[PDB]
Amino acid sequence: TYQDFPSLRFEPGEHGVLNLVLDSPGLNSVGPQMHRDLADVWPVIDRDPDVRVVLVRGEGKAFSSGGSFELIDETIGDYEGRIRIMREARDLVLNLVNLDKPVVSAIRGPAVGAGLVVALLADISVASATAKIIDGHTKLGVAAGDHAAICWPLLVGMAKAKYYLLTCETLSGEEAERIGLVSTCVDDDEVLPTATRLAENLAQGAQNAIRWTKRSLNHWYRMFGPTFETSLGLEFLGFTGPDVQEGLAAHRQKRPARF
Amino acid sequence: TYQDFPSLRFEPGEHGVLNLVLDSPGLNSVGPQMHRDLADVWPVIDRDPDVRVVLVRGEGKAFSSGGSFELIDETIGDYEGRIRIMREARDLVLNLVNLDKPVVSAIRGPAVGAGLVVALLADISVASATAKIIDGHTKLGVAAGDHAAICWPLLVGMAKAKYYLLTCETLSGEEAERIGLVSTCVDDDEVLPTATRLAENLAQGAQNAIRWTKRSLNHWYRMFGPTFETSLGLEFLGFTGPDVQEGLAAHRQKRPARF
Amino acid sequence: LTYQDFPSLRFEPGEHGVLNLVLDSPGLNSVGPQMHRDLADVWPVIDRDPDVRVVLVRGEGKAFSSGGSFELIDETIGDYEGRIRIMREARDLVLNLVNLDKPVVSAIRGPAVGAGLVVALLADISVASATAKIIDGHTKLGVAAGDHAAICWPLLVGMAKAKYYLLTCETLSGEEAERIGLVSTCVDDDEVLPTATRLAENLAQGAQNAIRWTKRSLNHWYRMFGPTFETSLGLEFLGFTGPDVQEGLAAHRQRPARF
Amino acid sequence: TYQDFPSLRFEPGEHGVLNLVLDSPGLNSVGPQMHRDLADVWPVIDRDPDVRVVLVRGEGKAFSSGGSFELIDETIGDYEGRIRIMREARDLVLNLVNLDKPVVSAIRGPAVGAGLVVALLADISVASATAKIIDGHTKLGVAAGDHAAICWPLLVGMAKAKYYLLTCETLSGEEAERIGLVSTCVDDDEVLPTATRLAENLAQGAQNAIRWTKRSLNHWYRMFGPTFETSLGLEFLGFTGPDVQEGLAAHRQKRPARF
Amino acid sequence: YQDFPSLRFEPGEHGVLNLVLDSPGLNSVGPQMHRDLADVWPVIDRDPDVRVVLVRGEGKAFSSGGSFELIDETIGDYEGRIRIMREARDLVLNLVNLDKPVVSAIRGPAVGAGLVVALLADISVASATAKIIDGHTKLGVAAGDHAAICWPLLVGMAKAKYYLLTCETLSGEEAERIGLVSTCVDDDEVLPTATRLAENLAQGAQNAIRWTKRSLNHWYRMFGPTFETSLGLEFLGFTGPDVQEGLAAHRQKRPARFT
Amino acid sequence: TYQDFPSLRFEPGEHGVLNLVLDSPGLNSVGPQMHRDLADVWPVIDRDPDVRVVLVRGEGKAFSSGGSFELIDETIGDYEGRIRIMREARDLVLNLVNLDKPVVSAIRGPAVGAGLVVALLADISVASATAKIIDGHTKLGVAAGDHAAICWPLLVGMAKAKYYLLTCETLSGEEAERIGLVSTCVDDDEVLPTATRLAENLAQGAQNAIRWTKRSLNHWYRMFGPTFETSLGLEFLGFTGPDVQEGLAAHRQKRPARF
Ligand SMILES: [Cl-]
């Protein structure tokens, strides 16, 4: 069923729960192959009669450190690759928003940028109190164009959304729950157990009621689709600008950027 | 003025406050007459020159347990009745959203389903810290189509909205106020006193200023009217499916549903 | 010479392209006719000024603004041509700020009321003193809350909290404002300006197009409620020639109002 | 039921068609009672199970010449009256957009201002080739705030809408059909027969299919409700300005207005 | 394309894919074709050998609409009805979300379920003597399978309501006059014209074309919730009495007697 | 007043009509100065108390041939220039949509791309029967991002919008009026006389009524602001692609493009 997504791990759980695991170098960074697979996996899951609920997590004590340096290098260096990556970033968000089956995220450690999209667009997000949530874009040197403009104002309100998206100050899981960015917060060691119970309970519930409830609520995000697409275009116009070269170098060299 | 709404209690307060009380068996369950009366009372109130403010509450330590089993039976069992009940559900929400006079809710004990609609669409909602707020639909086996999709994302943010609407985990009044679902939280024995003070202050205030302020704010909900109507359609298509028959049987038999 | 057309405002260069914009007038920085016009019209000039990267806006001393001056309110009520002029200024204060690409950081101490509050809360990052006093006062004065709240409060604090404060006119401390999402962050009064200064300087040293394009994209959410804002403003201004505002004002200028 | 609307003539037709006739002095001028009755009749029709379709027309060879001197002068000269009339103007539009039963208009001769609203918001509008369709507002000296901003762009497109609304050039029934403002155009003596056949065919069709089709389509107008309401406020702020006094004078005295 | 057995795929020149609806009985859409039409579009969008789709019926018919087999299942079986509904939803949404351009070549009848594809095509080439009929209200269900996402933005609301409510046949010539289709030619020039247009797109600047149509399609996406409301209402109609009579009347080639 | 706009001619007409004339080489091509001047002139006009209405036209037998080859070369060749030009393109559309004073366009000869923006976003557009209206972007090799996505669907409906925007087939002024793209069409020799009459009539009319009518109608375009900005970003991502290089070379060498 999932042969077309070789960078992703697909592990059956109980009662139609599918465990989807992000397992890659650099605390589950999202590189070119994973970026494509994450974009295009959701429609396949929605048509799979043996899956009722997706439970998504990173391998180990990390959800994702964000786009890999290889992903960013490809985007900066090649026009065709940049547009392909853009199409994938667009479709990750829209395919998730258009997925009728529910998604529960189990967020431990870092959850950044391209991986954070999945963590936060999950229907129910379970965050470690000590998770480290960072959108990351403005610190890298590009606009926050990969999901935040479709949802953050309707998660945390505009004042908190602007504070964290503009500054890229780290948000703990506990603080994320406090302001509404995530559904619930528990101790790190209880994140997977808690997310698993929630996923199993949805999987044994009334399926169309559940799916139709989340589909209806998702119209709120769909109404900000054009807003999201504008943000994405502006992010991608940034990848040929000078700031991102410094932002990326600063990341690679473990130092502060000097824009 | 209101002999045409026999299931509701109408009690004048001071300064143009109208007390509207839901008083029925099963902790103020909503049967066929009450469901009809709650839909259609609002336009009559808005045209009544002796009413300035509505203060809505249940009798005793309960707002409402929601639709009665017999109301649900009609929704499942009769084509014309189902459409009638759907139109009433539609118009409860839209007549409230289109009401220029302010409504204050005094929420004690359970507030569920069809009765929760009024509690939460009230302009100012006063919740007991120990109220029990439950949308209830997905546990019954139908989509949450009777109000939540017009408002919950804009009350609590999407992550909290999805958590409670999909799982139907009970929300206390205290937690509801923390996440923004209700306006204010006080101890159970202070709910009606607090609500009465707030209602009387509105009734003695500048009427057009108050009404025009809430009307303008209500544009936000009106923009999600189509979203709401889609949710309502999916809920009511659910009354034609197998899950609700199990969910209703389970509620009657005081046992877990086995979907 | 750049800002000579705005005589009521103080323009003081900070570090790294930060412009300090200071509201300094008698009566805890009350806003008179010149200042109301200058606050409306300054923003496009700032956006085109290549030497400004970030605006840090504050009142002089322990106040952001106490409200509109006697003279401003008197022209609003007493003269048709002047009233429409003031309405245009009120409209464009909100819309020019929502259309501003450069970031604005507000440092809110003491009272924040009227056009000053508009600026304080539409700032991209709002830093509130724990003991700031935030008041939307309109309905208490006898007019609709038409000067900004309808473009933003539901998407800051959710509808239940927005209706509560806008309909009751209860004072919101800076501490409570931060608890409910109205402002970005809260610190002790003596830390407000240092905190706001750090935040402003950090934005000014960051990746400029990334920051500006992020906030621009987020501001589409407020732009979508433009018509709702303009409805609220029209209703406020229809109120200015009604009997209620005479009593609400007469009362303020002289106890409970007797509407 | 219908006794509460004394200015309106209600005449049953065949198959559940209700004829609603506007019959008053000055080619069916709308006076204060008629303006109120037209606003408030629609919800009563929707609840009457003996009515399936409304066929609305003027008496004789005129739909309506628009507001009577009394109605216009009240709006200029009295605060309370102006607000009442504004409420009615608002609710004529919104109650029609929210009506599930179909309305067919039979438009002969003049259709102006306040009675034009019903003619054009009818689901099916049958225009005499020689009807004279005049929004009229800018020529009276006030904004076109009584319906056109909820619908004209989605009838004729924006360039045609602005042309006729800004200039107030008369639109013939024939030209109205050419550009899409009305559904069909026939000779004057065929208008009532054609409208009657269409109304009777709707009345004999599949009722919920028809009602739900038009309800769904009406969501498009509802999404421009806030745009409509801001137009309405601007119109009503104009009734306090100097131009309308000259506009009313010029209308009554068959001279070109000299603004 | 092996997964879409009911569709004919004929490669053309320059990356034009001809997609032909070919079934016995004027290309009625049966169960298999209804599923295939829903799900084919995302596969086309990912196929690097296809640049443009030219969609047509076999012979002098685009499609007579849903087959009797298809309507019977929809009426007769809950699980089937929900499946068919999902397909009806996804036909529209997958077409609206397709980046590659679609040219329709419309000859003879274009009805209901096959009319969806004809009119949601980016460029629609209609025979002057095509017969365009939405068909739903005459069958006895709401027009819920596409028209509410687009007709008001094609022909304006007055023409949209006229044809959707009455189901009067619209010729291709009149359809072009009112803006429902892009262009009109004689029957024998339809396929040549459509082919020339498709090849010109296929030889054009690809991303420019795709991004132009994608951007324009945001207008339809904004009415997604309106479309989904219409679809639910249609599907609630399929278990009502009217459709049984409409279907019977079509079989027997007599007028329906609904009321 | 207008010292800041050197590429534009500003000539007083009668009664507060300002004649704004585009006069430059190559049939009024838009170079870098004129591109910035056209973007930024509108807010200055709105504040100029001596101007009531703008009448915009080209010098001689052309409105504008659109962007000059130097303007397009800078967009392709320089990152900082490209971003500047994008800002100007954005602000031309938004500043025009946000202008309260009415604009009448007198369209003779070609009106293409960047010059076509002003011609079609004018409130009243008067087209020569033999004007040549060409959006032109897809033929150049970039998306139609400079205005069409904010308005064409609401002018001509989606079928006609897609036809002309995807193909870049020329549209005559006569055909443009038939489909609703422009307000009115007269023969070439009558364009300036007709536009002058209309502009003078507006300038002698009820000023606030006129301005508030067009402002309210412009909310329809504002609601598609995000859609417009998306299209603009996609156009500008096009300028670093291979197609536009070929499209520009094709134009220069007066030949067909070979993408
Ligand atoms: Cl990233």
mmCIF file of C-alpha atoms in Angstrom, chain A residues 138 141-144 149-151 153-154 157-160 162-163 165-167 169 178 224 227 230-231 234 238 243 259, chain C residues 124-125 155-156 178-179 181-184 198-199 203 205-208 210-211 213-215 217-222 224:
data_model
loop_
_atom_site.group_PDB
_atom_site.id
_atom_site.type_symbol
_atom_site.label_atom_id
_atom_site.label_comp_id
_atom_site.label_asym_id
_atom_site.label_seq_id
_atom_site.Cartn_x
_atom_site.Cartn_y
_atom_site.Cartn_z
ATOM 1 C CA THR A 138 12.247 34.127 10.263
ATOM 2 C CA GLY A 141 15.741 34.116 6.876
ATOM 3 C CA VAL A 142 12.479 33.377 5.036
ATOM 4 C CA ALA A 143 8.811 34.085 5.738
ATOM 5 C CA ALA A 144 6.751 31.610 7.831
ATOM 6 C CA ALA A 149 -0.643 31.434 8.281
ATOM 7 C CA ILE A 150 -3.444 28.844 7.758
ATOM 8 C CA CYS A 151 -3.854 28.171 11.481
ATOM 9 C CA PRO A 153 -4.230 32.896 14.612
ATOM 10 C CA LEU A 154 -7.097 30.405 15.105
ATOM 11 C CA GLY A 157 -4.929 34.301 18.788
ATOM 12 C CA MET A 158 -3.080 36.957 16.826
ATOM 13 C CA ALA A 159 -0.935 38.468 19.567
ATOM 14 C CA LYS A 160 0.635 35.203 20.591
ATOM 15 C CA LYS A 162 2.801 37.129 15.929
ATOM 16 C CA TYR A 163 5.066 36.966 19.020
ATOM 17 C CA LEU A 165 6.285 33.542 14.514
ATOM 18 C CA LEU A 166 8.165 36.812 14.289
ATOM 19 C CA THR A 167 10.696 36.221 17.058
ATOM 20 C CA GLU A 169 11.477 32.297 20.557
ATOM 21 C CA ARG A 178 -1.486 27.148 27.829
ATOM 22 C CA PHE A 224 -7.635 30.808 4.937
ATOM 23 C CA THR A 227 -3.766 33.460 2.943
ATOM 24 C CA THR A 230 0.325 33.888 -0.203
ATOM 25 C CA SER A 231 2.567 33.155 2.756
ATOM 26 C CA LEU A 234 6.612 34.901 -0.086
ATOM 27 C CA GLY A 238 12.952 34.394 0.005
ATOM 28 C CA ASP A 243 19.265 36.599 4.031
ATOM 29 C CA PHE A 259 21.700 39.692 8.863
ATOM 30 C CA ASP C 124 2.358 43.234 16.127
ATOM 31 C CA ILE C 125 3.938 42.603 19.515
ATOM 32 C CA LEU C 155 -9.263 36.495 16.987
ATOM 33 C CA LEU C 156 -7.313 37.633 20.073
ATOM 34 C CA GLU C 178 -2.174 38.440 28.669
ATOM 35 C CA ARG C 179 -3.981 35.479 30.358
ATOM 36 C CA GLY C 181 -4.589 36.404 24.663
ATOM 37 C CA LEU C 182 -5.285 40.089 24.024
ATOM 38 C CA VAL C 183 -1.586 41.085 24.345
ATOM 39 C CA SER C 184 1.606 39.259 23.465
ATOM 40 C CA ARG C 198 14.850 44.336 23.277
ATOM 41 C CA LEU C 199 12.050 42.870 21.151
ATOM 42 C CA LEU C 203 13.316 42.465 14.951
ATOM 43 C CA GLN C 205 18.433 43.144 13.396
ATOM 44 C CA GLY C 206 16.626 40.151 11.886
ATOM 45 C CA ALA C 207 15.807 39.116 8.340
ATOM 46 C CA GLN C 208 13.694 42.030 7.199
ATOM 47 C CA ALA C 210 10.974 37.451 6.206
ATOM 48 C CA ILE C 211 9.616 39.356 9.190
ATOM 49 C CA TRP C 213 6.091 39.146 4.817
ATOM 50 C CA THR C 214 5.199 36.990 7.889
ATOM 51 C CA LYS C 215 3.244 39.767 9.525
ATOM 52 C CA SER C 217 0.377 37.294 5.650
ATOM 53 C CA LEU C 218 -0.994 37.066 9.172
ATOM 54 C CA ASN C 219 -2.735 40.429 8.697
ATOM 55 C CA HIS C 220 -4.893 38.936 5.936
ATOM 56 C CA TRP C 221 -6.921 37.461 8.799
ATOM 57 C CA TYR C 222 -7.805 40.941 10.038
ATOM 58 C CA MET C 224 -10.959 39.549 5.951
#
